[PDB]
Design a binder for this molecule. Sequence first.
Ligand SMILES: NC(=O)c1c[n+]([C@@H]2O[C@H](COP(=O)([O-])OP(=O)(O)OC[C@H]3O[C@@H](n4cnc5c(N)ncnc54)[C@H](O)[C@@H]3O)[C@@H](O)[C@H]2O)ccc1C(=O)c1ccncc1
Ligand SMILES: NC(=O)c1c[n+]([C@@H]2O[C@H](COP(=O)([O-])OP(=O)(O)OC[C@H]3O[C@@H](n4cnc5c(N)ncnc54)[C@H](O)[C@@H]3O)[C@@H](O)[C@H]2O)ccc1C(=O)c1ccncc1
Ligand SMILES: NC(=O)c1c[n+]([C@@H]2O[C@H](COP(=O)([O-])OP(=O)(O)OC[C@H]3O[C@@H](n4cnc5c(N)ncnc54)[C@H](O)[C@@H]3O)[C@@H](O)[C@H]2O)ccc1C(=O)c1ccncc1
Ligand SMILES: NC(=O)c1c[n+]([C@@H]2O[C@H](COP(=O)([O-])OP(=O)(O)OC[C@H]3O[C@@H](n4cnc5c(N)ncnc54)[C@H](O)[C@@H]3O)[C@@H](O)[C@H]2O)ccc1C(=O)c1ccncc1
Lengths: 268, 268, 268, 268
Amino acid sequence: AGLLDGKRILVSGIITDSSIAFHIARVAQEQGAQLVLTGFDRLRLIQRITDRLPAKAPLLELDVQNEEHLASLAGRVTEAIGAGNKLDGVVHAIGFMPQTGMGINPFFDAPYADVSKGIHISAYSYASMAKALLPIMNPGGSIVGMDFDPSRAMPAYNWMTVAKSALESVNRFVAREAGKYGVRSNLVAAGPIRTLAMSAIVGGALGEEAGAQIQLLEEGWDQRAPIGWNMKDATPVAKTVCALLSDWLPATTGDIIYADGGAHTQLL
Amino acid sequence: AGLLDGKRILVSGIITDSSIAFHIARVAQEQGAQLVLTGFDRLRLIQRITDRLPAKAPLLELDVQNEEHLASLAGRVTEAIGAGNKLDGVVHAIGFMPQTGMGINPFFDAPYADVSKGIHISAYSYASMAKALLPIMNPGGSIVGMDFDPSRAMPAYNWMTVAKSALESVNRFVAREAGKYGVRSNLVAAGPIRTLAMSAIVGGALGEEAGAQIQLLEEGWDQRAPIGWNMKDATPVAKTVCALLSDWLPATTGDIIYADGGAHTQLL
Amino acid sequence: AGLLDGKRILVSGIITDSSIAFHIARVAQEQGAQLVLTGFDRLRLIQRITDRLPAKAPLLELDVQNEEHLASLAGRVTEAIGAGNKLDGVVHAIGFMPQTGMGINPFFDAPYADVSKGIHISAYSYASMAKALLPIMNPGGSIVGMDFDPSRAMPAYNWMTVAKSALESVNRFVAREAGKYGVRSNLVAAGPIRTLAMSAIVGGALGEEAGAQIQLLEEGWDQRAPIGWNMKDATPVAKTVCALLSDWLPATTGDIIYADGGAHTQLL
Amino acid sequence: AGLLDGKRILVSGIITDSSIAFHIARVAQEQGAQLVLTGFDRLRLIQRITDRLPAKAPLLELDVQNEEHLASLAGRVTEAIGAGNKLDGVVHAIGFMPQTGMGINPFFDAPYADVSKGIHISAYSYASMAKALLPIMNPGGSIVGMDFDPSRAMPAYNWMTVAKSALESVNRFVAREAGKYGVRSNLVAAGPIRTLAMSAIVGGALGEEAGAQIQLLEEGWDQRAPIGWNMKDATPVAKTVCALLSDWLPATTGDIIYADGGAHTQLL
Ligand SMILES: NC(=O)c1c[n+]([C@@H]2O[C@H](COP(=O)([O-])OP(=O)(O)OC[C@H]3O[C@@H](n4cnc5c(N)ncnc54)[C@H](O)[C@@H]3O)[C@@H](O)[C@H]2O)ccc1C(=O)c1ccncc1
Ligand SMILES: NC(=O)c1c[n+]([C@@H]2O[C@H](COP(=O)([O-])OP(=O)(O)OC[C@H]3O[C@@H](n4cnc5c(N)ncnc54)[C@H](O)[C@@H]3O)[C@@H](O)[C@H]2O)ccc1C(=O)c1ccncc1
Ligand SMILES: NC(=O)c1c[n+]([C@@H]2O[C@H](COP(=O)([O-])OP(=O)(O)OC[C@H]3O[C@@H](n4cnc5c(N)ncnc54)[C@H](O)[C@@H]3O)[C@@H](O)[C@H]2O)ccc1C(=O)c1ccncc1
Ligand SMILES: NC(=O)c1c[n+]([C@@H]2O[C@H](COP(=O)([O-])OP(=O)(O)OC[C@H]3O[C@@H](n4cnc5c(N)ncnc54)[C@H](O)[C@@H]3O)[C@@H](O)[C@H]2O)ccc1C(=O)c1ccncc1
């Protein structure tokens, strides 16, 4: 086969071996992609984690709140992949919201400065990364960001859901710019995945009530999904991101693909 | 009749006699409401404008980015309406986005600090105001915010559309808190209205292309609306906000009512 | 007050004193409307039930599957309200699906003839009634149909949910025709209401599983609704239909207003 | 590569060499799929057309309005693919609406019998085919139907848009049944494609106004699509259907993938 054979793809967002971006990177290399990775603050830890990927991949530092990192990103990537080559895919899998904007801290008590940091990292940065990278992307390219369905409110996720609503809207504008380069921009809305942090939260890290509510949310997800949902398995989400990075959804942009077991299409 | 007879309603957002909140205030007083107004920076100008309203209404200063204004808002309103009385309605009609986030300035060139100010004023503040005012609202009360449909991208509005997407998501969370007080929270998504600023923009204030595009957007709106759309008339939008402030939509919250001529329900 | 003062409104759909149309008629007369009622097969029973309405209202027979009834409807209504007068409002509150299309009978086992009857009565008829009545409606008029949110599948409702999906689509086309008359067309999506039939179904009339599932659906509705949901009280739904029949939502058509406690805006 | 290597896929809907199902079949064979085709009435013509496909494929007759064809379909397919083998994919690409339900014939003038035939063929049949075929489908299988976005009304398509709204709702119920077999069910919402019939319609076959409106609809589609839209090329739509038939979107069901150039995500 080789779904992504020959494609050069930048993958951001790996922080632990349970990160959804770690599985996206693994599956993309299994599929023939040549990768460049970006990591945020603990580069030594990230390098050690990505050593377990099937193939080597250069790791570049990128703090999306750092204008300088962003301004120099395209030059560093070109250096990593070689003059004359461009990227075919970009994976944005970054997100963050201060504790005051999630959990049991009341929705009305999150200070704007925390919300703003969260929106900067989780939403604005999708536009930041596309701005930095489209100049070095090939026609037929694909930009994919990680989302979760924020069309209805829900317990605990609070401001992070607002940040996803902003992100879905940013994606539709990025598609307009990306289109001028022959590039698609889309998001994958995933079901809940037991990442290290999510496990910490279910385990009570942000208050017992938030944990109980997240837990309830996960069970209802598998019940509602007509094909079921396994929160411990990120592979189905990684495969979907690879589908969008491939040439097999060439007429979809500014769009959202739901890799959630079909749960969002069922009331109960 | 007297649709809002006896209700005490706070109305924010009046800046000129063409402000949508000026018409909402006028219609609400025609309907029997007793109002309290809040204004942002030019209080002398706002007082002079609101002198033309059918009845008197106390004017309080409120800069939604000022924590102190917000912290003292409930006490000032109680003083204006009298100890022992509470509000039955709150109208949020505030919005703003720096020029870099709208117009012909490229979407990718808006700095985050500008976007963040815009989201603070246009979205977060809906939660700020509800936080400040629910403690002084009566069961059966109603909070209404001004929106425009951001479900699809569009030219020129750029980051302001992202700010509406965030606002619609904030509204669904505010409904959850407001519900504990027996209060509803909803938004009215209006068609384009020729406010002073919008007229300035169509006239070229943010670049000729942005103006031409806004103009095209307005014409297509009236064509698509099965009952037509008159951008020079804010009355149909004011009436809709009054419908939500009344007791005649008592089972709708966390929701959006479209006062746009039905344009959003038609492709062409 | 008098929300509907002086308006002539046709109300279809009354079959028992627990029919949602019975409450819509009662509230509309409390609000000053002069009504004309249509009933389907048991006119003697319907007359006896509507005798309890606050005011008298002529009852006309109308089987929406009868072309002749439809062809003569406008003439009979004009006779009931008097030559030279026209209707200002029309309420469609009719729906039906054979048992094979609902309940525990498997979704795949409903024969098309049953589904087709159900869609004829529940969806096509909204266009049939508008076709018959727009010629005798005044500018500023309003047509309202009863809906329930079919955007996601759910247990038990099966083909009736498909019929609501068709109805919402018919409504957007009827708005286009109604607009030529200066008339609005909208639907009210209600939460579950304990009508006689729904009570029969919860009580097991279409299989124990369907009943258990409907029951579960109702409880979750009140839990999800930020202001709660009372399935035994149709008044909040009647008031919402009256809001659309009034002149207070004059810029909304081809649209759906949710009178469901805000449940559809919350995941959990 | 071989995206569909080894999969057995039934493809319905081929009537001319410009049929979207002809391209779906061609691309699926280019990708390694072994096909079985079904055709509706002119089997001699269909056989002659499919002779041009890259590989041979048995052709079975199937009139979805024929209960007998449906009742015997699974047995005929098993015979064509051999005892002990099951299908991995099913493509529903059938649709039809009598002329009275489309075109310049007024929306209110389509008789229910025509609408009902149209809904039978275009919507109910998606459930009919899944009912017939799930018993002979393998876990991990995929059912895909052709759709066009009916969320807003539009000129000319009239009742066919209502039939798509019904179909999208049927798909969400079929996903629930298909899930019990480990099978996904999804639709691809395509942009306008110049099929023989659509070309006939643009050319005036259903009235000059319908043609002018369809033409306007197509131009606006390419303008709105951030990556553009080529109505003469069905390949991008075929590739998307193959993506859903593959194992690369394994967590999506009861869903709709838009292969429309991203046009539905942009207002203008
Ligand atoms: N359950 C989940 O884990 C989940 C996660 N996502 C998204 O998937 C993406 C990856 O998250 P994950 O793998 O769960 O968590 P993660 O902690 O493994 O990694 C994401 C990255 O955030 C990156 N980071 C933070 N700040 C920066 C910065 N300033 N610059 C660069 N990088 C930064 C960080 O270093 C980390 O690598 C995010 O966009 C998530 O929101 C989408 C859907 C679901 C989800 O949250 C959900 C919620 C409610 N309903 C359904 C689904
Ligand atoms: N066309 C329009 O004018 C329009 C306006 N709205 C909303 O209606 C509301 C009122 O806007 P308007 O009447 O047009 O304009 P406006 O300039 O009259 O007034 C709004 C208020 O913003 C207030 N302001 C700014 N900063 C602050 C602050 N820090 N604290 C307190 N107040 C502040 C300001 O003083 C002013 O009174 C806003 O939420 C708008 O976004 C909603 C829909 C439409 C619209 O923009 C649109 C766009 C695209 N498609 C369809 C419709
Ligand atoms: N729970 C409910 O009772 C409910 C009802 N509605 C709609 O409200 C309307 C009235 O229904 P109801 O009051 O519950 O029941 P009903 O039995 O009182 O009356 C409706 C009418 O159907 C009329 N009828 C049947 N055939 C014909 C015909 N051929 N010609 C003329 N009239 C005919 C019949 O005579 C009866 O008067 C229908 O469109 C319903 O579908 C909308 C929402 C909810 C709902 O079903 C729901 C389901 C799932 N989630 C949320 C909400
Ligand atoms: N533009 C298009 O051609 C288009 C087509 N589709 C769908 O694609 C599918 C294939 O249509 P096509 O390839 O355009 O046309 P087609 O005429 O090539 O073929 C479809 C099949 O209908 C089959 N047929 C009719 N009755 C029966 C029956 N009783 N039993 C079995 N088969 C039957 C017929 O024999 C034919 O093979 C249908 O579901 C379409 O509605 C989806 C989207 C677009 C579209 O219509 C559109 C409209 C508005 N905005 C955007 C897109």
